[PDB]
A paper describes a structure:
NTA is catalyzed by a group of enzymes called N-terminal acetyltransferases (NATs), which belong to the Gcn5-related N-acetyltransferase (GNAT) family of enzymes. NatA and [name] are heterodimeric complexes, each with a distinctive catalytic subunit and a unique auxiliary subunit. NatA accounts for 38% of the human N-terminal acetylome, acetylating small N-terminal residues after removal of the initial methionine residue, while [name] modifies N-termini with sequences of MD-, ME-, MN-, and MQ-. In addition, hNatB is upregulated in human hepatocellular carcinoma, where it has been suggested as a potential therapeutic target as silencing of this complex can block cell proliferation and tumor formation. hNatB-mediated NTA of α-synuclein (αSyn) has been shown to increase αSyn stability and lipid binding, and to reduce aggregation capacity.
In this study, we report the 3.5 Å resolution cryo-electron microscopy (cryo-EM) structure of the ~130 KDa hNatB bound to a bisubstrate CoA-αSyn conjugate together with a structure-guided analysis of mutational effects on catalytic activity. Consistent with previous NAT structural studies, the atomic model of hNatB features a catalytic subunit, hNAA20, that adopts a canonical Gcn5-related N-acetyltransferase (GNAT) fold (Deng and Marmorstein, 2020; Neuwald and Landsman, 1997). The 21 helices of the core region also form a number of TPR motifs, which come together to form a ring that completely wraps around and extensively contacts hNAA20 within its hollow center. The α28 helix closes the core ring structure, locking hNAA20 in position, and bridging the N- and C-terminal and regions. While no corresponding small molecules have been identified to play a similar role in hNatB, our model shows that this interaction is replaced by an extended loop that connects the α31 helix with the α32 helix of hNatB-[name]. In the cryo-EM map, density for the CoA-αSyn conjugate bisubstrate inhibitor is well resolved, allowing us to confidently model the CoA portion and the first 5 N-terminal residues (of 10 residues present) of the αSyn portion. Here we observe that the positively charged hNAA20-Arg85 interacts with the negatively charged 3'-phosphorylated ADP portion of CoA to form a salt bridge while Arg84 makes Van der Waals interactions. Hydrogen bonds are formed between the backbone N-H group of αSyn-Met1 and the backbone carbonyl group of hNAA20-Phe111, as well as the backbone carbonyl group of αSyn-Met1 with the sidechain of hNAA20-Tyr138. The only sidechain that forms a hydrogen bond with hNAA20 is αSyn-Asp2, which hydrogen bonds with a hNAA20-His73 ring nitrogen and the hNAA20-Thr75 sidechain.
Residue numbers in the entry:
A (entry chain A): 2 to 141, 143 to 160
B (entry chain B): 13 to 40, 45 to 705, 723 to 869, 881 to 916, 931 to 972
C (entry chain C): 1 to 5
The structure:
C-alpha cells in the first residue's frame, strides 16, 4: 500500500471507492476546497498496481483560546476489495497525528447511526460519543438518518 | 437602515426578494435594479441585461453593488464583464487593499495572467504586505505555463520570477511555507534541480514541515531528476524502515539499487555512504534488507503485506537481469503459494497476486491451482453433491482460487460444455454462500457475490464465442437474483446496464443507473454508459435527461473550478494552481463533454425543430454557425473509466492500451461525423435571404465517412467489458451516411439553381429531379433494411433483435434531416412557382411520396401490436419472467416514442406540398 | 462522511 496525497486527476479514479451506498461524491467545488485549504488531511492509499484502495478527507476548523480547535474527518472510505486490511485504522491514525501536530484538542466525526460497522470501528479506535444530530443527512425521497457526532480528545493543546 | 432592512428582505427567496425590491423603486438606490435582476435572471436574458448593463456603468464603488454584479456576471458565464467594474472603481479612487485585491481576483478569474502581475505589484507597492508580493510571482508563472514551448518560458518569464523571489531571500522576508513551496516550484521549472534541492535540504526547508512527508518527498524528486542514485537509495531505505509497507518506496529502492549495481558504485572512505547514509550496493545488501523486513514484520500483530510483495518484486527484477544466479529468494511458485496461505481470506489476495502472476513458468498454471486448492478447508466431495466450504474464511480462500483459475487461463480453454459445467458449479457455490452473511445490513455485499460475477463472465463469454442467445437470459436472471439478494453491489448494476443495453432494452438501464448514485464527477467517468445508449435505442426522454445532467455538471465545473483556482491564492497553495489548471483543462477537453454537447444539440433539433419551432429560430437559440466548432479536436481527453468493471480475464484479453487508443480514435471519428452533420444542418437556415462554407463541410464529412469506413474494415474485437464500440459500424450497414450525403448534395444543387434561376438552367433542373428520384430510392432501402421483427419465439427462446431497433432509430434521425433539407428547397421553389415548370412538378411527387413512405414507416412502428401479443430453480424460473418482461416493455417504450415522433413529424409535410 | 451541501 502506497500512502500519498490525493492529487487532482485522482478524482477520475475513485470509482471503486465511491460506488458504495455509504460513500458520497460531494461534487468538484468540495474536493477543490479541501485540496486548496487543507491538503494535509487528504491522504489517499494506492495499491501495487493502480487500484485506489481508499482515501480520507479531513479539515481542522475551530477557534483556539476556547478549546474548540478540532480536527474534523469529512470523509473516509476503503474499496470493498481492500477492506479488513487495517487500512482505515492507518488513515485515521495519520489524521489523528496530523491534527495533533498542529496543536488540536480533539478529533471530530459525523457517522450516520445506521451502520454498526463504522460506529463499532470508531468505538474501538477510541472515539467516544457526543451529541446525536437529528435529521442531519439531508437525502439521497429516502428518509433522513440521524448522525452521531463522535469526538476523541487527544493530547490537549492550544 | 435602508441598506440592511430593505436588502435583507430583498433576498428572501425569489419574489419576496424581487417584489420587496421591485417595490423599492417607488419606495426610495444604486443597486435596486441589480437586486431585482439577480432573482429574475432565470430564463429571460434581455430583461436582466437591460438593468445589469444599465447599472454596471454608473461608477458603483459600493460593496453591495459590486458583490451582486460579480455574481450576476459570473453566473451567466460572462466573467469578462467583472474585471471592468473594480478597475472602473479603481480609476476613481485608489483603494488601499479591498478594491485592488478584488481587481486582482477578477483578473485571475477572467484569465488575464499577464495583466494580473501588474495589479499584484501595484497592490504590493500600496501596502507592503508579504502575501501580495508572491501573488505577482504566481501570476508570472501562470503566464509561463500557458505560453509554453518557447524562449519566453525559461528566458523571459520564469527567470524573471526566480529573480523576483531571490530579491526577497536576500532579506529575511520569506518566513512562511507557501513562499518556500513557490520558490521550489520556480527552481524546479527552470531546470535548476541541483539549486532547488538545496533550498529544501538547507534552512528554508524547516518551514516546510506541514504535510506528512513534504520534505522527503520533495528531496526525492530532485534526487531522481539529478540522477543522484545513492542519496535516493538511502532515503528509500530510511523511509522503509519507518513503515516497511509503502510500495512507492520499495519501487524506488529497487530502482536505485539496480542502477547502483549498473553504475558499479563504490562507497567513500570517510563518513556515511551518501548524504542520507547507509546506501546499499548489490543484491546481497539488497536481499538481506528484504529478508529482514519480512522477519521484522513476522513479529507484529498487524500482518503487513508489504515485504511479501517486495520479495516477489525483487525476485522479478533480479530475474530481469541475471536468472542463473539465485541466492535464497526461492521459487516464485512457493512464494505465491505461501502468500496465498497467509493473505488468502482477504478480498485483496487476487489484486496482489495478479501483478506478479507473470513469474509463473506459464506451463504450471494447472499445477499451481491444484496446489492452492489443497489448503482450503473444504468439505467431503462425494456426498452426492459438491465440495463446499464451511466458514466465511474458507469461502473467500476458495473464491480467490476460482479467480486465480480464471486469470491463469483455464476457463478459456474449455469448449462450451465444461464452460457451462463451470457456471453450474459457480451457481451452486453462490446459492450455498448465502447461508453465511444472512444478517447483512443491506449495505454490505454478500460474502459470495463474486461467485455470480464469475458465473456471468463465463456465460457472456459463451454467448460471444458461439452466438447462443440462450445464455444472455441466464446471465440476466443470475444478475437479477444477485442484485435482489445484495441490492448494493455496483458490479451487478453496471453489468446489468451493459447487458440490457447490448440486448436493446434501455428503460431498466436508466432505472439501474439512477440506483447506483452517480453524482457529479461520476458524470464524466460513468455517465458514458448512459449517453452512448440513450438516444441510440430510441429513448428520447431518458437521453434528454442524461444530456441535461451531464451538461449541468460540466458547466458548473467551468464556473466552480475557476472560482476555486481564485481561492488557491488566499490560502497560499501555490503548488495546486498548476494542478487545478490541468484539472480544469482535462475536464473541459473531455471526450464526453463534446459528445454530450453535440447529442444535446441534435436532440433539441430533431425533437423541436420544424415541429414546434422553426429551424432558424431553433438554431438562433443555440448559437450555432456552420463556421465555428467549440470542440478541441487536438486535446480531446477520453477520461472515461473503462476499468470500473471487475475483470478476472487472463491479463492479455481484458483491456490493452491499443484497445483504449482505438476506442478513443473511433469515438473521435464518430464525434466528427456527428458534429459535421450538426454544423451542416445549422446552415440551411440563413442559406436563404453563404454556400462556400457548407460546400467545404461536405468535403470534410465525405472524407471522414471514408476514414470511418476504412476503420470499420479494420475488424477490431473489443472485450466484453471494454470500450463499447460506437454506432459508426451500424451507421454504414443500414445505409444512412449516403442517404444524408445525397441530401446535402441536393441542398447545394438547389442553392445553385436559386443563384442562377429557372431561365436557362435546364442542366441543373434535371440533376435536381434525378437527385429527388434517387434519394427516395435510398429512403426506401433504409426501410427495407430496417424491416423485421423485434422479438421472436423461435424454439422456445426469445432471440431479441436490437439491430432492427438501431436501424429504426437511424431512419428517424435520417428522415428528420431529409425533411429539414426538403423544407429548405420548398423555400427556394415557392417564390419561383409564385412568379411562374418541369422541376416543381417532380418536387411535388417527391413530397407526395415522402409522405406515403413516412406513413408506411409509421405503420411498421406498429410492432406494438406484435409485441403486446407475446406470451413469454423455482426462483430462477421466476426472474426470467421479469428479465423478459423488462426487455419487452423496453422495446415497447422505444417503439412508442419513435412512433410518436414520426406521427408529429409527418404533420410537417403539410407545409412542403407546393 | 459529511452531508453534500
Ligand atoms: C471502515 C473501513 C475503512 C474498513 O476499515 P479497514 O480499512 O478494514 O480498517 P480496520 O481493519 O482497522 O477496521 C477497523 C476495525 O473494525 C473492524 N471491522 C471492519 N469492518 C467490520 C465489519 N464489517 N464487521 C465487524 N468488524 C469490522 C476491523 O476488524 C477493525 O477492528 P480490528 O482492529 O480488531 O480488526 C471501510 O468500511 C470504510 O470506511 N469505507 C466504507 C464506509 C465509508 O466510506 N464510510 C466511512 C465511515 S465514517 C463516515 C464519515 O466520516
Amino acid at each position: 500500500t502506497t500512502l500519498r496525497a490525493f492529487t487532482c486527476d485522482d478524482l477520475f479514479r475513485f470509482n471503486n471507492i465511491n460506488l458504495d451506498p455509504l460513500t458520497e461524491t460531494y461534487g468538484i467545488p468540495f474536493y477543490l476546497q479541501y485540496l486548496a485549504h487543507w491538503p494535509e488531511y487528504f491522504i489517499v492509499a494506492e495499491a501495487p498496481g493502480g487500484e485506489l484502495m481508499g482515501y480520507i478527507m479531513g479539515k481542522a476548523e475551530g477557534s483556539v483560546a476556547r478549546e474548540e480547535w478540532h480536527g474534523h474527518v469529512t470523509a473516509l472510505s476503503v474499496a470493498p476489495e481492500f477492506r479488513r486490511l487495517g487500512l482505515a485504522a492507518k488513515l485515521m491514525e495519520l489524521l489523528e497525528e496530523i491534527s495533533e501536530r498542529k496543536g488540536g484538542f480533539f478529533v471530530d466525526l459525523f457517522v450516520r447511526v445506521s451502520n454498526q460497522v463504522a460506529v463499532n470501528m470508531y468505538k474501538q479506535l477510541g472515539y467516544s460519543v457526543y451529541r446525536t444530530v437529528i435529521e442531519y443527512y439531508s437525502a439521497s425521497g429516502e428518509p433522513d438518518e440521524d448522525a452521531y457526532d463522535m469526538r476523541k480528545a487527544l493530547s490537549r493543546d492550544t | 437602515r435602508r441598506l440592511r432592512p430593505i436588502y435583507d428582505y430583498l433576498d428572501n427567496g425569489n419574489n419576496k426578494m424581487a417584489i420587496q425590491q421591485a417595490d423599492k423603486l417607488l419606495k426610495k438606490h444604486c443597486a435596486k435594479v441589480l437586486k431585482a435582476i439577480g432573482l429574475q435572471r432565470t430564463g429571460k436574458q434581455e430583461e436582466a441585461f437591460t438593468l445589469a448593463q444599465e447599472v454596471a456603468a454608473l461608477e458603483p464603488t459600493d460593496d453591495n453593488s459590486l458583490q451582486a454584479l460579480t455574481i450576476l456576471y459570473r453566473e451567466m458565464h460572462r466573467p469578462e464583464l467583472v474585471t471592468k467594474l473594480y478597475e472602473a472603481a479603481v480609476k476613481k479612487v485608489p483603494n488601499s487593499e479591498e478594491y485592488h485585491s478584488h481587481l486582482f481576483m477578477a483578473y485571475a478569474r477572467v484569465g488575464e495572467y499577464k495583466k494580473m502581475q501588474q495589479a499584484g505589484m501595484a497592490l504590493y507597492k500600496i501596502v507592503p504586505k508579504n502575501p501580495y508580493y508572491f501573488w505577482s510571482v504566481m501570476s508570472l508563472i501562470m503566464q509561463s505555463i500557458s505560453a509554453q514551448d518557447e524562449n519566453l518560458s525559461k528566458t523571459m518569464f520564469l527567470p524573471l520570477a526566480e529573480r523576483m523571489v531571490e530579491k526577497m531571500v536576500k532579506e529575511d522576508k520569506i518566513e512562511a511555507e507557501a513562499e518556500v513551496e513557490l520558490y521550489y516550484m520556480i527552481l524546479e521549472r527552470l531546470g535548476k534541480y541541483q539549486e532547488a534541492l538545496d533550498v529544501i535540504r538547507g534552512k528554508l526547508g524547516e518551514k516546510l514541515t506541514s504535510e506528512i512527508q513534504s520534505r522527503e518527498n520533495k528531496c526525492m524528486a530532485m534526487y531522481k531528476k539529478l540522477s543522484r542514485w545513492p542519496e535516493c537509495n538511502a532515503l528509500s531505505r530510511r523511509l522503509l524502515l519507518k513503515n516497511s509497507d509503502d510500495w512507492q518506496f520499495y519501487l524506488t529502492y529497487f530502482d536505485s539499487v539496480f542502477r547502483l549495481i549498473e553504475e558499479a558504485w563504490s562507497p567513500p572512505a570517510e563518513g556515511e555512504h551518501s548524504l542520507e547514509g547507509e546506501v546499499h550496493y548489490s543484491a546481497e545488501k539488497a536481499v538481506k534488507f528484504i529478508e529482514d523486513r519480512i522477519t521484522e514484520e513476522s513479529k507484529s500483530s498487524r500482518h503487513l503485506r508489504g515485504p511479501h510483495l517486495a520479495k516477489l518484486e525483487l525476485i522479478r527484477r533480479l530475474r530481469s537481469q541475471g536468472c542463473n544466479d539465485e541466492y535464497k529468494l526461492g521459487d516464485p511458485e512457493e512464494l505465491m503459494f505461501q502468500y496465498f496461505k497467509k493473505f488468502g481470506d482477504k478480498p485483496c489476495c487476487f489484486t496482489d497476486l495478479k501483478v506478479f502472476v507473470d513469474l509463473l513458468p506459464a506451463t504450471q498454471c494447472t499445477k499451481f491451482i491444484n496446489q492452492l486448492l489443497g489448503v482450503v478447508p473444504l468439505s467431503t466431495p462425494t456426498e452426492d453433491k459438491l465440495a463446499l466450504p464451511a466458514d466465511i474464511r474458507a469461502l473467500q480462500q476458495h473464491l480467490c482460487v476460482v479467480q486465480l483459475t480464471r486469470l491463469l487461463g483455464l476457463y478459456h480453454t474449455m469448449d462450451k460444455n465444461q464452460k457451462l459445467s463451470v457456471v453450474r458449479e459457480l451457481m451452486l457455490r453462490y446459492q450455498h454462500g448465502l447461508e453465511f452473511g444472512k444478517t447483512c445490513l443491506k449495505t454490505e455485499l454478500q460474502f459470495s457475490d463474486y461467485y455470480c460475477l464469475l458465473a456471468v463472465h463465463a456465460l457472456i463469454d459463451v454467448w460471444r464465442e458461439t452466438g447462443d442467445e440462450t445464455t444472455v437470459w441466464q446471465a440476466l436472471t443470475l444478475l437479477e437474483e444477485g442484485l435482489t439478494h445484495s441490492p448494493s453491489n455496483a458490479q451487478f448494476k453496471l453489468l446489468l446496464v451493459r447487458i440490457y443495453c447490448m440486448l436493446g432494452a434501455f428503460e431498466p438501464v436508466v432505472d439501474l443507473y439512477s440506483s447506483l448514485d452517480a453524482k457529479h464527477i461520476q458524470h464524466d467517468t460513468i455517465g458514458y454508459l448512459l449517453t452512448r445508449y440513450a438516444e441510440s435505442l430510441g429513448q428520447y426522454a431518458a437521453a434528454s435527461q442524461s444530456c441535461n445532467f451531464a451538461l449541468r455538471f460540466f458547466h458548473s465545473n467551468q464556473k466552480d473550478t475557476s472560482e476555486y483556482i481564485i481561492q488557491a491564492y488566499k490560502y497560499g497553495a501555490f503548488e495546486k494552481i498548476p494542478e487545478f489548471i490541468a484539472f480544469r483543462n482535462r475536464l473541459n477537453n473531455s471526450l464526453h463533454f463534446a459528445q454530450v454537447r453535440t447529442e444535446r444539440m441534435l436532440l433539441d433539433l430533431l425533437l423541436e425543430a420544424n415541429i414546434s419551432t422553426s429551424l432558424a429560430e431553433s438554431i438562433k437559440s443555440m448559437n450555432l454557425r456552420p463556421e465555428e466548432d467549440d470542440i478541441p479536436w487536438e486535446d480531446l481527453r477520453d477520461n472515461r473509466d473503462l476499468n470500473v468493471f471487475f475483470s478476472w480475464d487472463p491479463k492479455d484479453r481484458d483491456v490493452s492500451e491499443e484497445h483504449k487508443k482505438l476506442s478513443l480514435e473511433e469515438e473521435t471519428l464518430w464525434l466528427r461525423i456527428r458534429s459535421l452533420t450538426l454544423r451542416l444542418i445549422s446552415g440551411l437556415p440563413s442559406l436563404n435571404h453563404r454556400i462556400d462554407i457548407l460546400r467545404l463541410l461536405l468535403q470534410q464529412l465525405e472524407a471522414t465517412l471514408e476514414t470511418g469506413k476504412r476503420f470499420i474494415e479494420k475488424d477490431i474485437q473489443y472485450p466484453f467489458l471494454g470500450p463499447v464500440p460506437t454506432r459508426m459500424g451500424g451507421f454504414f450497414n443500414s445505409g444512412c451516411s449516403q442517404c444524408q450525403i445525397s441530401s446535402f448534395y441536393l441542398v447545394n444543387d438547389i442553392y445553385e439553381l436559386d443563384t442562377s434561376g429557372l431561365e436557362d438552367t435546364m442542366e441543373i433542373q434535371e440533376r435536381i429531379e434525378n437527385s429527388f428520384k434517387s434519394l427516395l430510392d435510398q429512403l426506401k432501402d433504409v426501410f427495407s433494411k430496417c424491416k423485421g421483427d423485434l422479438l421472436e419465439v423461435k424454439d422456445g427462446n426469445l432471440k431479441t433483435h436490437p439491430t432492427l431497433l438501431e436501424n429504426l432509430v437511424f431512419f428517424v434521425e435520417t428522415i428528420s434531416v431529409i425533411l429539414w433539407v426538403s423544407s429548405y428547397c420548398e423555400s427556394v421553389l415557392r417564390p419561383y412557382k409564385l412568379n411562374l415548370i418541369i422541376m416543381p412538378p417532380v418536387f411535388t411527387s417527391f413530397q407526395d411520396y415522402v409522405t406515403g413512405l413516412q406513413t408506411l414507416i409509421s405503420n411498421v412502428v406498429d410492432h406494438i401490436k406484435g409485441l403486446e401479443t407475446h406470451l413469454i430453480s423455482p426462483e430462477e424460473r421466476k426472474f426470467s419472467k421479469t428479465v423478459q418482461g423488462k426487455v419487452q416493455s423496453s422495446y415497447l417504450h422505444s417503439l412508442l416514442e419513435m412512433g410518436e415522433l414520426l406521427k408529429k413529424r409527418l404533420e410537417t409535410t403539410k407545409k412542403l406540398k407546393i | 462522511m459529511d452531508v453534500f451541501m
